[PDB]
Design a binder for this molecule. Sequence first.
Ligand code: L85
Length: 121
Amino acid sequence: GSHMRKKIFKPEELRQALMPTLEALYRQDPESLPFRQPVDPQLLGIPDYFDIVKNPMDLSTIKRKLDTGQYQEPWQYVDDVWLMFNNAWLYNRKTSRVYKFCSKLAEVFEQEIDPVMQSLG
Ligand SMILES: O=S(=O)(O)c1ccc(/N=N/c2ccc(O)cc2)cc1
């Protein structure tokens, strides 16, 4: 149905789409919060966060791959934000707070970043 992979993808176009999307993530203020900014194991009281989560891919880092073009394609970006949802789903072992923060994100985020990948191409 024309989505994900289609155009040659330039970070300027990609972002045109992947920006409002990552934004839809951010608008979830807390729900996106364990992602937007580095989880901050020093803050959340986490010692081995970068041991548990191999790729927390903060919504700031993802937004960066966007500002710089470290994806060459939108789904690579979604892979990052889903890489994020992962640190949520890998650490919060499905039964924690940020787990709900993410699950909701994935819900909204993609609810926008899906037709976005399509919007994009
Ligand atoms: O900025 S806050 O809204 O105050 C806040 C509060 C708690 C948070 N917890 N983050 C976690 C991340 C991983 C984990 O396994 C457990 C917790 C993160 C942010």
